[PDB]
Amino acid sequence: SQIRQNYSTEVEAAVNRLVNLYLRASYTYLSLGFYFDRDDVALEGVCHFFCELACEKCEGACRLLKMQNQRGGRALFQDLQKPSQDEWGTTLDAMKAAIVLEKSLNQALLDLHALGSAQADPHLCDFLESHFLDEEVKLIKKMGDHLTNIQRLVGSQAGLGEYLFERLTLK
Amino acid sequence: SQIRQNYSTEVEAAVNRLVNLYLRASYTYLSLGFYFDRDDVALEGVCHFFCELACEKCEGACRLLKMQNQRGGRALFQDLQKPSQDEWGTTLDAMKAAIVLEKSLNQALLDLHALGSAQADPHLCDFLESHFLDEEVKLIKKMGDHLTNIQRLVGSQAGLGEYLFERLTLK
Amino acid sequence: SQIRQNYSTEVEAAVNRLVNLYLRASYTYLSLGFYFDRDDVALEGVCHFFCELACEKCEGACRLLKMQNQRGGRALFQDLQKPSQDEWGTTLDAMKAAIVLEKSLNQALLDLHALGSAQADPHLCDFLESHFLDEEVKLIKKMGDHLTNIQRLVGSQAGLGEYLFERLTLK
Amino acid sequence: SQIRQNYSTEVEAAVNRLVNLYLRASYTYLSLGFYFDRDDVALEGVCHFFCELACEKCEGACRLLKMQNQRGGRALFQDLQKPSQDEWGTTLDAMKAAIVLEKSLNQALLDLHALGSAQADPHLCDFLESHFLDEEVKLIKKMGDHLTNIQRLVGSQAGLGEYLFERLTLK
Ligand SMILES: [Au+]
Ligand SMILES: [Au+]
Ligand SMILES: [Au+]
Ligand SMILES: [Au+]
Ligand SMILES: [Au+]
Ligand SMILES: [Au+]
Ligand SMILES: [Au+]
Ligand SMILES: [Au+]
Ligand SMILES: [Au+]
Ligand SMILES: [Au+]
Ligand SMILES: [Au+]
Ligand SMILES: [Au+]
Ligand SMILES: [Au+]
Ligand SMILES: [Au+]
Ligand SMILES: [Au+]
Ligand SMILES: [Au+]
Ligand SMILES: [Au+]
Ligand SMILES: [Au+]
Ligand SMILES: [Au+]
Ligand SMILES: [Au+]
Ligand SMILES: [Au+]
Ligand SMILES: [Au+]
Ligand SMILES: [Au+]
Ligand SMILES: [Au+]
Ligand SMILES: [Au+]
Ligand SMILES: [Au+]
Ligand SMILES: [Au+]
Ligand SMILES: [Au+]
Ligand SMILES: [Au+]
Ligand SMILES: [Au+]
Ligand SMILES: [Au+]
Ligand SMILES: [Au+]
Ligand SMILES: [Au+]
Ligand SMILES: [Au+]
Ligand SMILES: [Au+]
Ligand SMILES: [Au+]
Ligand SMILES: [Au+]
Ligand SMILES: [Au+]
Ligand SMILES: [Au+]
Ligand SMILES: [Au+]
Ligand SMILES: [Au+]
Ligand SMILES: [Au+]
Ligand SMILES: [Au+]
Ligand SMILES: [Au+]
Ligand SMILES: [Au+]
Ligand SMILES: [Au+]
Ligand SMILES: [Au+]
Ligand SMILES: [Au+]
Ligand SMILES: [Cl-]
Ligand SMILES: [Cl-]
Ligand SMILES: [Cl-]
Ligand SMILES: [Cl-]
Ligand code: NA
Ligand code: NA
Ligand code: NA
Ligand code: NA
């Protein structure tokens, strides 16, 4: 490569894996969003929340690909694994699955920082800081806030709570 | 002092103590507001209500300091005691703590009027009338209204009531 | 905590201490600002400079608290120590006290970076970079510039110099 | 009188005396303002400051007269004594004379509150609160601030200080 400078093969491979995780997360959120659009589930605000996350994870993948090319790395695409469930249960079940997924992305980001730090690659570290580390923390906080409100609303009338959360928080 | 006129040392000291109470109230409301921002509490409207009160109590302290200087008194700052709790329980527990705090400020204001009246200091009495006595009564009425609505919403489904109050009153 | 990830108890405690330092700095600047509003000191531009810094340090504390909650840490408030003086002397004395205070905050920020680096916490390091390290350097440079101009203006006519600095720099 | 109610002859007389003090203060400020317009004094900002105060004291007299008529009292005008000096010395001498005059008005206002309180006349007390007590405190604070700045500027070059104060504060 004519442009590549201070860009380890280890970072290049890790960036390709992270693209694959972001795209699988996008696909998962696509599945979650259509599940909540089913006529027998019918929680529009839950569909909107997950379809917006599908878009944000795709954007994360696009950003990582653009950065791979800017550094002289080579994008390599793998199979995208189907999402872990076909049916996602309650809003609560789905928001718990989403926070597990987000913590796994966050761990992949922290693991890529550790690799970039070991490889002395400050451009990579700046890239993760600028577009990923804070966005992921902000999203996990919001999902935690959602899980607390959903859990509060379960009590004894679970249908009522699920309706009210969708109507008054996911508006 | 070249400007001081009809301004008792007793009033001067009482004004400094009242600044300390308003600043401690501001600090308490800061603590209450961040408690309701915790991911395991997550009541945004409750956070907004208390952070707005932190701002209003700071404004009260600033007004008292400005008046101290206008009369030729000397501002003296003491330690600000940490708030009375680290964790504030339910919205109900927190609004009860806030109305106790407000009644204690109101009593300090009435005590300062009594001192100003005994010292024949009509400028002080006009100052309290203009910026404090009515604002405190209006705030305590609002907190009473809130406590009545929260209490009505407890019934048997406490989580549901706490969510609905935050969503539909503290909007 | 449902959200906490890669957030050391050591960082959590250090963040709470830093909130306490920012709030004590805010309180110090409140004291400095009202001292310069005294009828026997009467330097309006000096009052405005310090009251603006009281606001900026409070903002620093609020930002640190918001970040504590975003990471799943728990805000813990301590007593706020009264400022180090009741009377602050000349503009020069006050700007020297302010630069000592600012260097002590800056050292606390650098100490928190060192802890975050030792704990491999890149989100913390990004947070300090984004809202604190450059703001503190920019402020200390401005205070140095002020101290140089004040020192130049002392010569033999100290009252004249103090008036002119307040009128023509702190405008 | 068809309208008079709860309006003591003692208050009525005190209001007429206070009109006479406000008008004499207006006349004094007229004298001060023209002195600073003399070609051999020539401090335009000092002239503007005192002529504005002549206008404000006249407004005070007009307000007291309007209130006398609203209560069914009878305005009685006396001779207006010429001002205490023909020549007013330095800006410092003049601002010292102005703060003495203002403290004497303020004492007359406090004395009228004491009389109104003894006569159980809450309308009078509200009138003084609304238009006089705070305005007088705010003015005496400003004059104190001015005296501090003038005193700072004397040092060894009194002409230079007097010029700079007029140019940069009384702008
Ligand atoms: Au959807
Ligand atoms: Au949707
Ligand atoms: Au969709
Ligand atoms: Au996409
Ligand atoms: Au996309
Ligand atoms: Au994409
Ligand atoms: Au794309
Ligand atoms: Au890194
Ligand atoms: Au790095
Ligand atoms: Au969520
Ligand atoms: Au959610
Ligand atoms: Au949401
Ligand atoms: Au808040
Ligand atoms: Au809030
Ligand atoms: Au807040
Ligand atoms: Au404040
Ligand atoms: Au404030
Ligand atoms: Au304040
Ligand atoms: Au303030
Ligand atoms: Au009173
Ligand atoms: Au009074
Ligand atoms: Au309330
Ligand atoms: Au409330
Ligand atoms: Au409310
Ligand atoms: Au100030
Ligand atoms: Au100021
Ligand atoms: Au201020
Ligand atoms: Au603040
Ligand atoms: Au603030
Ligand atoms: Au703050
Ligand atoms: Au704040
Ligand atoms: Au760091
Ligand atoms: Au770090
Ligand atoms: Au400075
Ligand atoms: Au400065
Ligand atoms: Au400046
Ligand atoms: Au004039
Ligand atoms: Au004039
Ligand atoms: Au004039
Ligand atoms: Au007039
Ligand atoms: Au007039
Ligand atoms: Au008049
Ligand atoms: Au008139
Ligand atoms: Au009165
Ligand atoms: Au009265
Ligand atoms: Au003045
Ligand atoms: Au003056
Ligand atoms: Au002035
Ligand atoms: Cl599979
Ligand atoms: Cl304590
Ligand atoms: Cl101490
Ligand atoms: Cl005479
Ligand atoms: Na290199
Ligand atoms: Na008096
Ligand atoms: Na971790
Ligand atoms: Na009567």
Q: How far does the centroid of ligand 41 lie from the alpha carbon of residue D79, in Å?
A: 18
Q: b vs e for C114-143, b when ≥16 Cβ sit within 10 Å of the residue's Cβ?
A: ebbeebebbbbbbbbeeebeeebeebbeeb
Burial label, D5 (beta-carbon count in 10 A; 0-12, 13-18, 19+)? exposed
User: Is D143 close to B3, i.e. CB distance below 8 A?
Assistant: yes
Q: How far apart are CA A23 and CA C144, in angstroms?
A: 51
Q: How far apart are CA C98 and CA C143, in angstroms?
A: 8
Q: Which residue of A has its CA nearest to B90?
A: A152
CA atoms within 13 A on the CB side of A156: 5
Contacts 24+ apart (CB under 8 A), D145-150: D145/C39, D145/C42, D145/C44, D146/C42, D146/D95, D147/B2, D147/D92, D147/D95, D147/D96, D147/D99, D148/B2, D148/C39, D148/C40, D148/C41, D148/C42, D149/C42, D149/C163, D150/D91, D150/D92, D150/D95
The 10 Å Cβ neighbour count of residue D84 is: 12
SS (H, E, C) chain B: CCCCCCCCHHHHHHHHHHHHHHHHHHHHHHHHHHHHHCCCCCCHHHHHHHHHHHHHHHHHHHHHHHHHHHHCCCCCCCCECCCCCCCCCCHHHHHHHHHHHHHHHHHHHHHHHHHHHHCCCHHHHHHHHHHHHHHHHHHHHHHHHHHHHHHHHHCCCHHHHHHHHHHHCCC
Alpha-carbon radius of gyration of chain D: 18
Residues 6+ apart with CB under 8 A from D155: C157, C158, C159, C160, D161
Q: How far does the centroid of ligand 7 lie from the alpha carbon of residue A45, in Å?
A: 25
Which candidate from B27, B66, B76 shows the least CB-CB separation from C77? B27
B65 interaction partners in chain D (CB closer than 8 Å): none
Experimental method: X-ray
Q: How far does the centroid of ligand 38 lie from the alpha carbon of residue D33, in Å?
A: 6
Closest to D162 measured CA to CA, from C36, A97, C163:
C163
What was the resolution (in A) of this experimentally determined structure? 1.9
Residue C75 belongs to a domain: yes
Burial label, A81 (beta-carbon count in 10 A; 0-12, 13-18, 19+)? exposed
The answer to whether C35 and C73 have CB atoms below 8 angstroms apart is no
Q: How far apart are CA A69 and CA C62, in angstroms?
A: 39
The 10 Å Cβ neighbour count of residue A157 is: 13
The answer to whether B69 and C37 have CB atoms below 8 angstroms apart is yes
Number of folded domains in chain B? 1
D155 interaction partners in chain C (CB closer than 8 Å): 157-160
The 10 Å Cβ neighbour count of residue D122 is: 11
Which candidate from A107, A110, A141 shows the least CB-CB separation from C70? A141
Chains C and D touch, contact meaning at least 3 pairs of CB atoms under 8 angstroms apart: yes
Q: How far apart are CA B111 and CA B105, in angstroms?
A: 10
**3-state secondary structure at position A77:** coil
The alpha-carbon gap from B130 to the nearest alpha carbon of chain D, in Å, equals 10
H or E element, residue C10: helix C9-37
For chain A, the first-to-last Cα distance in angstroms comes to 50
Residue B122 belongs to a domain: yes
Closest to C127 measured CA to CA, from C25, C6, C28, C30:
C6
H or E element, residue C103: helix C91-118
CA atoms within 13 A on the CB side of B134: 6
Residue D89 belongs to a domain: yes
Which candidate from C40, C69, C72 shows the least CB-CB separation from B34? C69
Residues 6+ apart with CB under 8 A from D148: B2, C39, C40, C41, C42
C25: which 2 tokens? 């700095």
B167 interaction partners in chain A (CB closer than 8 Å): 164, 168-169
D19: which 2 tokens? 């009109």
Closest to D28 measured CA to CA, from D130, D99, D77:
D99
Q: Which residue of C has its CA nearest to A148?
A: C2
User: Is A134 close to C130, i.e. CB distance below 8 A?
Assistant: yes
The alpha-carbon gap from B43 to the nearest alpha carbon of chain A, in Å, equals 8
Q: How far apart are CA B63 and CA B77, in angstroms?
A: 15
Q: How far apart are CA C83 and CA C147, in angstroms?
A: 21
The answer to whether D75 and D143 have CB atoms below 8 angstroms apart is no
User: Is A134 close to C123, i.e. CB distance below 8 A?
Assistant: yes
Q: What single-letter DSSP state applies at residue C40? A: T
Q: How far apart are CA C157 and CA B44, in angstroms?
A: 56
C157 interaction partners in chain D (CB closer than 8 Å): 155-157
Phi, psi torsion values for B80, nearest 5 degrees: -100, 120
- State CA D21 to chain mean position distance: 8
Closest to A141 measured CA to CA, from B93, C168, D4, C1:
C1
Q: Residue A149 carries which side chain, given as an amino acid letter?
A: N
The CA distances from residue D118 to B120, D7, D114, in Å, are 11, 12, 6
Phi, psi torsion values for C80, nearest 5 degrees: -100, 120
B126: which 2 tokens? 């006009």
The CA distances from residue A90 to A142, B18, D146, in Å, are 18, 52, 71
Closest to D20 measured CA to CA, from D112, D98, D99:
D112
Residue C15 belongs to a domain: yes
Angle at C73 between CA C69 and CA C74, to 5 degrees: 85
The answer to whether A148 and B39 have CB atoms below 8 angstroms apart is yes
Q: How far does the centroid of ligand 53 lie from the alpha carbon of residue C113, in Å?
A: 25
For residue B49, what is the domain's CATH number? 1.20.1260.10
Q: Residue D127 carries which side chain, given as an amino acid letter?
A: F
List beta partners, residue C94: none
C63: which 2 tokens? 């930002």
Chains that touch D (3 or more CB pairs under 8 A): B, C
Q: Residue A85 carries which side chain, given as an amino acid letter?
A: Q
Best probe of the C interface among D102, D149, D169, by most C CBs < 10 A, is D149
| Chain D residues contacting C via beta carbons under 8 Å | 141, 144-146, 148-149, 151-157, 160-161, 164-165, 168-169
Dihedral Cα B4, B8, B9, B10, nearest 10 deg: -150
- State CA C64 to chain mean position distance: 13
Residue pointed to by tokens 């606001």: C55
The CA distances from residue C89 to C41, C42, C45, in Å, are 9, 12, 16
D78: which 2 tokens? 């006396």
Alpha-carbon radius of gyration of chain B: 18
Chains that touch C (3 or more CB pairs under 8 A): A, B, D
The answer to whether C105 and C25 have CB atoms below 8 angstroms apart is yes
Residues 6+ apart with CB under 8 A from C64: C15, C18, C19, C22
Residue pointed to by tokens 């690659």: A121
User: Is C3 close to A106, i.e. CB distance below 8 A?
Assistant: no
Q: At what angle do helices D134-154 and D91-118 cross, to 10 degrees?
A: 160
The 10 Å Cβ neighbour count of residue C82 is: 17
The CA distances from residue A87 to A34, A41, A154, B2, in Å, are 10, 10, 20, 80
* D120 Ramachandran zone, left/alpha/beta (phi>0; psi -120 to 50): left
The answer to whether D112 and D56 have CB atoms below 8 angstroms apart is no
Q: How far apart are CA D94 and CA D147, in angstroms?
A: 10
Best probe of the C interface among D103, D141, D152, by most C CBs < 10 A, is D152
Angle at A53 between CA A121 and CA A157, to 5 degrees: 135
User: Is C163 close to D154, i.e. CB distance below 8 A?
Assistant: no
**3-state secondary structure at position C80:** strand
Closest to D8 measured CA to CA, from D107, D124, D130, D111:
D124
Q: How far apart are CA A151 and CA A134, in angstroms?
A: 26
The answer to whether D28 and D84 have CB atoms below 8 angstroms apart is yes
List beta partners, residue C80: B80
**3-state secondary structure at position A128:** helix
User: Is C42 close to D145, i.e. CB distance below 8 A?
Assistant: yes
Burial label, A131 (beta-carbon count in 10 A; 0-12, 13-18, 19+)? middle
Burial label, D134 (beta-carbon count in 10 A; 0-12, 13-18, 19+)? middle
Residue A116 belongs to a domain: yes
Q: How far apart are CA C14 and CA C113, in angstroms?
A: 10
Residue A2 belongs to a domain: no
User: Is A157 close to B159, i.e. CB distance below 8 A?
Assistant: no
Residue pointed to by tokens 């009644």: B103
The alpha-carbon gap from A97 to the nearest alpha carbon of chain C, in Å, equals 12
Residues 6+ apart with CB under 8 A from D121: D6, D7, D8, D11
A53: which 2 tokens? 């996350």
List helix spans (H) across A38-157. Answer: 44-71, 91-118, 122-128, 134-154
List beta partners, residue B80: C80
DSSP for D74-130 reads: -----PPPPPS-S---SHHHHHHHHHHHHHHHHHHHHHHHHHHHHTT-HHHHHHHII
Domain of residue D140, residue span: 9-170
The CA distances from residue C97 to C84, C90, D29, in Å, are 9, 11, 42
For chain B, the first-to-last Cα distance in angstroms comes to 50
User: Is A160 close to B158, i.e. CB distance below 8 A?
Assistant: no
The answer to whether B70 and D141 have CB atoms below 8 angstroms apart is yes
- State CA B61 to chain mean position distance: 10
Dihedral Cα A72, A73, A77, A81, nearest 10 deg: -130
Residue B159 belongs to a domain: yes
The alpha-carbon gap from C75 to the nearest alpha carbon of chain A, in Å, equals 15
CA atoms within 13 A on the CB side of C124: 29
Angle at A141 between CA A140 and CA A143, to 5 degrees: 65
Residue B165 belongs to a domain: yes
Burial label, A103 (beta-carbon count in 10 A; 0-12, 13-18, 19+)? middle
The CA distances from residue A94 to A145, C27, D53, D92, in Å, are 14, 46, 73, 77
